Write a protein that binds this ligand. Structure first.
Ligand SMILES: [Cl-]
Ligand SMILES: [Cl-]
Ligand SMILES: [Cl-]
Ligand SMILES: [Mg+2]
Ligand SMILES: [Mg+2]
Ligand SMILES: [Mg+2]
Lengths: 214, 213, 213, 214
């Protein structure tokens, strides 16, 4: 449910005709909740524009996967390409949105999402290129790590990028980083403002128009 | 005389070679070349690739057999044995942002001395990089990556060695083809010249030195 | 919808625009778009292109009609009117080695801050360039070239705006498509989605803003 | 005849299966003199590997030209490509041989071949990339300009490149630049060693090996 809560609210941010890259894991659930009237185009780092859902059994192709090597389909009008062209789309500003997972986000909007020193070293993959390059970065992450706030004053985990992310969506809150700090825009119907504040170590500016939603 | 038996790997891939190997998590990877390398236990390799795939597949099999001294990759998280060897100190790992890796390999392929990229600025990737400011903005100078042999995978070759790729098996393969000194392409099918149109070929035969299967 | 009438050019290309225009000596150039610009005397243009073609064709027609304040090209030798206006001082000409022009445009398209190239070192091209030494070899630092509008030519587009090119008409067109803010593609045919395979498309429709005929 | 003499001798330098780029003008005559047992592949800057001769009347294609926009054919197994890929072949050391024309060559092996100040300003085109990147550069040029030596001590015309070319072929001489200076390896059957030296302002090292030929 908390992961569904995040994916549904993130999906509402997507606009018709956008090129969108969903990180592996939680962000991928976003594809299950696009409104019927919104057609977007999905891009994957392994080299495809026009990614589609997993194939029905028997319809797999060994050469056609997502960035986790799981089998996908390609939609009509898809284009496949080499990895330099892939990161030219990403680093060169042609990707409208990327939704990425998160370990921490801080008061400057900096995301840490690729390494936990001493515990988990998978490498960064495309993450630093995507955060640096996407026209809009949305972080999709559970609000805490078994109680520890993940929205902190200054990241203690290694940064993915010094780029300021455009939106944070958790199961409790929607926060927009701004030049003044983190602007809390919305809170979950199932939480309270006092709980969000108790569970957020970073300073939050509170919007005049705070909405309920996700 | 580009097409050769797989046994010729042993004359072409030396002990301690620096190799570029195509494939994204094992998709579009030259599995048969890899198996021959393992067969003759060709070791102390430096492998430039997107990742170390998985323990039972592609480049991951090289690591399982400890044939690698160093890997230059963007991702190792799907291969616990790569991580284990990294922590024990037996395997040197250099982690490169995937887009920077693509452009550093490409720089070698097309004769550039380096490329400036904003990716990695202000992260650990900045360590031991020259930083260059252009119109107020900071970029990391990232440098060409070279290799002795590119071991690439392609879908088809015509008689002249022109290659085409298939869907997301393309990834780093055509880039590596341009960057290494010698290029060995594992292909699924040999087709007559004239089957691959001038408009669809992606790697010209002139840069492919050897073909297997 | 991407496809628009050619008469709309006068609404998308402004006086004093910085334009990338595709084509190699008029081959693969958007001849109909250029004719619209001439019809409506859209002037004071800065044109980035391989060349100024010939007096009677392609980009040459823009120079004939004195619509360019500046050209950034690798070659002008086939257009005596470009040379005339250069000598008189009416037209500013920035000459760029053709391979550097390709990579400077590409660099803007893929989001690089610059590239280092050995081309032009120790020639007049070195003037006003930062020189960078890598492994004892000298490179010129060449900087990304941006533009307001790319005016490109392609053979076909599908309903989604995916483009393919034809033989030596490709040249600079797909590179300029990535580099400019707004991209307008003149195409010869509109074909159904599914006519252009994912393995053969060279410019994805996502980066094409407008298509004419 | 002198242009024939040069083209024929340059053609003998080519080896089977090489990728070759011929510059506009004198070097393009080389193609007419390739031995029948030597198959090479021609590259053109505007984006083709596998160029062939001009088409018979009626077989022209508007999209298939050489670097002077003249109609060409494409041979079986040709590949066409964009200008970035084209100059990646050239600058990246994938071009086995380029044969270019010449205004001056000097004792350092430096070529000037793209501009004459105060007269011809055509721009450089691909000439700087080709001289810098070709595995082997052959300069094909008349020995003098109306009697004035073009093989000089130091170029006075603008350099195309600081790269040391690998061979100079005139109607009188075959000269190989080396670490010690210019090595005269052959002379025309129709001339004399004294005439060659008289018509070269640069210091020439005469080979013990000296041959007649072109
Ligand atoms: Cl399906
Ligand atoms: Cl014919
Ligand atoms: Cl004599
Ligand atoms: Mg309260
Ligand atoms: Mg608080
Ligand atoms: Mg080779």
């Amino acid at each position: 449910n908390p992961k569904e809560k995040i994916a549904i609210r993130v999906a509402q941010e997507l606009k018709k005709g956008q090129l969108v890259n969903l990180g592996i894991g939680l962000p991928t659930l976003v594809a299950n909740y696009i409104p019927k009237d919104i057609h977007v185009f999905f891009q994957s780092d392994n080299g495809i524009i026009g990614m589609g859902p997993a194939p029905k059994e028997g319809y797999e192709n060994s050469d056609l996967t997502n960035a986790g090597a799981s089998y996908i389909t390609a939609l009509p009008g898809a284009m496949t390409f080499d990895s330099a062209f892939s990161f030219g789309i990403i680093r060169g500003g042609h990707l409208d949105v990327t939704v990425l997972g998160g370990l921490q986000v801080d008061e400057e909007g900096h995301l840490a999402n690729w390494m936990i020193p001493g515990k988990m070293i998978p490498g960064m993959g495309g993450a630093m290129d995507l955060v640096t390059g996407a026209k809009k970065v949305i972080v999709a992450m559970t609000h805490t790590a078994k109680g520890t706030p993940k929205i902190v004053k200054k990241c203690t985990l290694p940064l993915t990028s010094i780029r300021k992310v455009d939106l944070i969506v958790t199961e409790l809150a929607v926060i927009e980083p701004t030049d003044e700090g983190l602007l809390l825009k919305e809170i979950s119907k199932e939480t309270t403002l006092d709980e969000v504040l108790k569970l957020t170590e970073a300073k939050l500016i509170i919007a005049d128009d705070l909405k309920i939603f996700a | 005389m580009k097409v050769v038996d797989i046994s010729k790997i042993n004359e072409l891939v030396k002990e301690g070679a620096t190799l570029m190997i195509g494939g994204f998590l094992g998709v579009g990877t030259p599995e048969n070349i890899i198996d021959e390398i393992i067969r003759h236990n060709i070791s102390n390799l430096t492998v430039i690739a997107n990742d170390t795939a998985f323990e039972d597949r592609g480049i991951g099999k090289l690591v399982k057999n400890k044939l690698c001294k160093k890997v230059i990759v963007s991702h190792i998280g799907t291969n616990p044995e790569t991580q284990r060897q990294m922590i024990e100190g037996t395997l040197e790992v250099e982690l490169v942002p995937q887009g920077t890796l693509a452009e550093r390999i490409r720089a070698a392929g097309v004769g550039l001395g380096g490329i400036l990229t904003p990716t990695g600025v202000g992260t650990v990737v900045e360590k031991d990089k020259k930083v260059i400011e252009v119109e107020g903005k900071k970029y990391l100078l990232e440098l060409p990556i070279h290799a002795d042999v590119a071991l690439i995978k392609a879908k088809k070759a015509d008689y002249l060695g022109n290659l085409v790729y298939n869907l997301t098996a393309e990834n780093f393969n055509p880039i590596m083809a341009l960057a290494a000194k010698t290029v060995i392409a594992e292909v699924e099918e040999i087709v007559p010249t004239g089957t691959l149109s001038p408009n669809e070929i992606k790697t010209p035969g002139i840069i492919v030195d050897y073909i297997v299967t």
